[PDB]
Amino acid sequence: MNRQELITEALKARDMAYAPYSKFQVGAALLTKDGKVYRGCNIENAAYSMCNCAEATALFKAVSEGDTEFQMLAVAADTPGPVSPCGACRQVISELCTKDVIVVLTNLQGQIKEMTVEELLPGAFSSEDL
Amino acid sequence: MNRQELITEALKARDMAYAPYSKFQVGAALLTKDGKVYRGCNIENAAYSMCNCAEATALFKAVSEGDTEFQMLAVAADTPGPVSPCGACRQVISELCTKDVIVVLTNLQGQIKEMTVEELLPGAFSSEDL
Amino acid sequence: MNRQELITEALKARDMAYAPYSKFQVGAALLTKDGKVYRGCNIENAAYSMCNCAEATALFKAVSEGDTEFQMLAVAADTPGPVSPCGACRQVISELCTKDVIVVLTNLQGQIKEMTVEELLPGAFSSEDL
Amino acid sequence: MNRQELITEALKARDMAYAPYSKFQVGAALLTKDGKVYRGCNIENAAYSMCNCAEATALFKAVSEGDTEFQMLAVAADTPGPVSPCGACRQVISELCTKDVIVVLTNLQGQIKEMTVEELLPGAFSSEDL
Numbered sequence: 094m095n096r097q098e099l100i101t102e103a104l105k106a107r108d109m110a111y112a113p114y115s116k117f118q119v120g121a122a123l124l125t126k127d128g129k130v131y132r133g134c135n136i137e138n139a140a141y142s143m144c145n146c147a148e149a150t151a152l153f154k155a156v157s158e159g160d161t162e163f164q165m166l167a168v169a170a171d172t173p174g175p176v177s178p179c180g181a182c183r184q185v186i187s188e189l190c191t192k193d194v195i196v197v198l199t200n201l202q203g204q205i206k207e208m209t210v211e212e213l214l215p216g217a218f219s220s221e222d223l
Numbered sequence: 224m225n226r227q228e229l230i231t232e233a234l235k236a237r238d239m240a241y242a243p244y245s246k247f248q249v250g251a252a253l254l255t256k257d258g259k260v261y262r263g264c265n266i267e268n269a270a271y272s273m274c275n276c277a278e279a280t281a282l283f284k285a286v287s288e289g290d291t292e293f294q295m296l297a298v299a300a301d302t303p304g305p306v307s308p309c310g311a312c313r314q315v316i317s318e319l320c321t322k323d324v325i326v327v328l329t330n331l332q333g334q335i336k337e338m339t340v341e342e343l344l345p346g347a348f349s350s351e352d353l
Numbered sequence: 354m355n356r357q358e359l360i361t362e363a364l365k366a367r368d369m370a371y372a373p374y375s376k377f378q379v380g381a382a383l384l385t386k387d388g389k390v391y392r393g394c395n396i397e398n399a400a401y402s403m404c405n406c407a408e409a410t411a412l413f414k415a416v417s418e419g420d421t422e423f424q425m426l427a428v429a430a431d432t433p434g435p436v437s438p439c440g441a442c443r444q445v446i447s448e449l450c451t452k453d454v455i456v457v458l459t460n461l462q463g464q465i466k467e468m469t470v471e472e473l474l475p476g477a478f479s480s481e482d483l
Numbered sequence: 484m485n486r487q488e489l490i491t492e493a494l495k496a497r498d499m500a501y502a503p504y505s506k507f508q509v510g511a512a513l514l515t516k517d518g519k520v521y522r523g524c525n526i527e528n529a530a531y532s533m534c535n536c537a538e539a540t541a542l543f544k545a546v547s548e549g550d551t552e553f554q555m556l557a558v559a560a561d562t563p564g565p566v567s568p569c570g571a572c573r574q575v576i577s578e579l580c581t582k583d584v585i586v587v588l589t590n591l592q593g594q595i596k597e598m599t600v601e602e603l604l605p606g607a608f609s610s611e612d613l
């Protein structure tokens with residue numbers, strides 16, 4: 094399961110998206126240490142603040158199943174460049190993923206930006222601050 | 224899969240909860256029309272606003288898998304009476320579940336309150352308002 | 354400051370709304386015991402989950418100023434019937450307002466629904482449950 | 484109104500915080516181009532996902548008043564190093580503040596980190612992506 098294959102997983106996950114308000118579908122694929130893949134997609138609500146992102150869906154899914162050790166996260170959306178995770182998602186990612194997990198950001202045109210969880214949100218607010 | 228059995232599913236789901244900040248674990252079990260069960264649990268974050276509830280986790284899981292027709296939702300937590308879904312969750316539930324889906328609320332001491340999605344949040348803000 | 358006058362405050366507050374994504378402006382006016390009025394409006398974000406509602410904006414404003422005793426809350430939006438506070442807002446309201454606070458819901462066509470904070474979200478999840 | 488004076492505003496704002504769950508008070512002070520200051524503080528909820536941050540409170544306050552041109556944002560909390568805005572707040576900030584706005588991060592022990600909105604969340608998901 095290389096990053097290209099994980100990207101294909103995220104591209105498939107994207108098609109499950111429930112985004113009738115923004116019409117902006119996002120897909121995510123989370124790869125665990127053991128090689129299992131969890132797909133995620135954004136799920137919206139008439140009350141916008143309740144919308145849930147693809148990255149979060151995938152992580153919530155994995156964690157709820159007892160899978161907490163990840164190696165890579167791919168995210169895909171039809172954006173100009175590699176899709177940029179929103180601040181809230183970066184926060185969830187920084188909490189649920191170890192700092193060296195690889196985050197693969199892409200769009201639907203082959204643009205690829207790869208970074209670590211740490212780079213995704215440097216000095217991210219964390220439990221240590223509490 | 225009667226409500227007692229769905230409650231047991233939610234009680235098991237509750238044990239997967241990641242709630243180190245509130246130390247308040249919540250479990251949810253979503254039953255689809257075809258009889259499949261999706262378990263959910265709350266997942267917290269050092270940045271409190273990012274916490275995700277059990278009900279949402281279960282629904283996000285189901286919807287991301289393509290399951291969108293539900294018949295019952297059980298929610299369990301160690302509260303004095305049947306656990307009360309927070310407003311945000313009631314909003315997500317009112318969006319992702321049809322009005323006649325049965326919501327079974329319970330705690331860890333047999334208290335049971337049963338209501339419909341409609342009763343859970345009467346006149347809930349919806350897409351029609353937009 | 355009767356409810357009709359508070360409604361006019363909410364209507365004015367609505368015009369301050371920053372909602373370029375939904376194009377759905379909401380206004381809120383919070384009346385304190387001492388008779389001071391705090392206006393609120395929804396403020397959106399490209400990342401939908403970050404959108405903030407009018408009711409919340411007004412309450413956050415009042416509380417941040419040290420005002421914590423309220424008597425009435427008016428909410429207005431261009432909806433078919435009286436605007437229905439989203440679940441998240443009902444949750445914030447149930448926390449920051451006493452159960453006796455009057456919530457006046459209206460649209461831009463004179464439809465008015467009045468209820469208490471308790472009635473807005475009966476049995477709302479609260480600190481006592483934690 | 485230099486940054487030291489804005490920091491003192493944030494420190495005062497912090498004392499208005501309503502954070503009975505985390506017991507973690509945060510303060511924010513937003514300086515407009517015209518030199519007006521808006522104070523913000525975090526306001527929590529029994530339902531954690533409903534918690535609102537100091538930075539957001541200040542910005543919501545300013546925007547609701549019609550003030551939309553800012554020059555500096557100070558944030559203070561009792562953290563080990565300069566307080567780190569959570570991802571959600573960085574997202575709100577990247578939307579409501581121009582990329583040149585100066586963000587002053589500090590704690591209660593004189594540690595100060597200064598950066599631009601762009602640096603706070605480089606390549607932040609934005610409307611252009613939608």
Ligand SMILES: O=C1CCN(C2C[C@H](O)[C@@H](CO)O2)C(=O)N1
Binds near residue numbers: 148
């Ligand atoms: O973090 C990324 C960027 C934001 N989107 C979302 C949620 C929402 O349904 C839509 C518009 O914000 O894209 C994601 O799903 N993931």
Ligand SMILES: O=C1CCN(C2C[C@H](O)[C@@H](CO)O2)C(=O)N1
Binds near residue numbers: 307
């Ligand atoms: O709607 C219900 C009530 C709220 N809790 C949550 C989220 C959070 O981790 C914790 C404290 O609010 O309980 C749920 O998980 N479900």
Ligand SMILES: O=C1CCN(C2C[C@H](O)[C@@H](CO)O2)C(=O)N1
Binds near residue numbers: 139142377379394407
């Ligand atoms: O609770 C009510 C219903 C929801 N709206 C919002 C936030 C968002 O900008 C827009 C669409 O959900 O209306 C409010 O401002 N208040």
Ligand SMILES: O=C1CCN(C2C[C@H](O)[C@@H](CO)O2)C(=O)N1
Binds near residue numbers: 505524525537569572
């Ligand atoms: O972005 C920063 C970091 C997070 N805190 C918050 C909200 C919440 O009440 C508390 C714990 O997350 O700190 C802020 O107020 N601002």
Ligand SMILES: [Zn+2]
Binds near residue numbers: 146147148180181183
């Ligand atoms: Zn996101």
Ligand SMILES: [Zn+2]
Binds near residue numbers: 277278308310311313
């Ligand atoms: Zn909830």
Ligand SMILES: [Zn+2]
Binds near residue numbers: 408439
């Ligand atoms: Zn709302």
Ligand SMILES: [Zn+2]
Binds near residue numbers: 270536569570572573
């Ligand atoms: Zn924050």
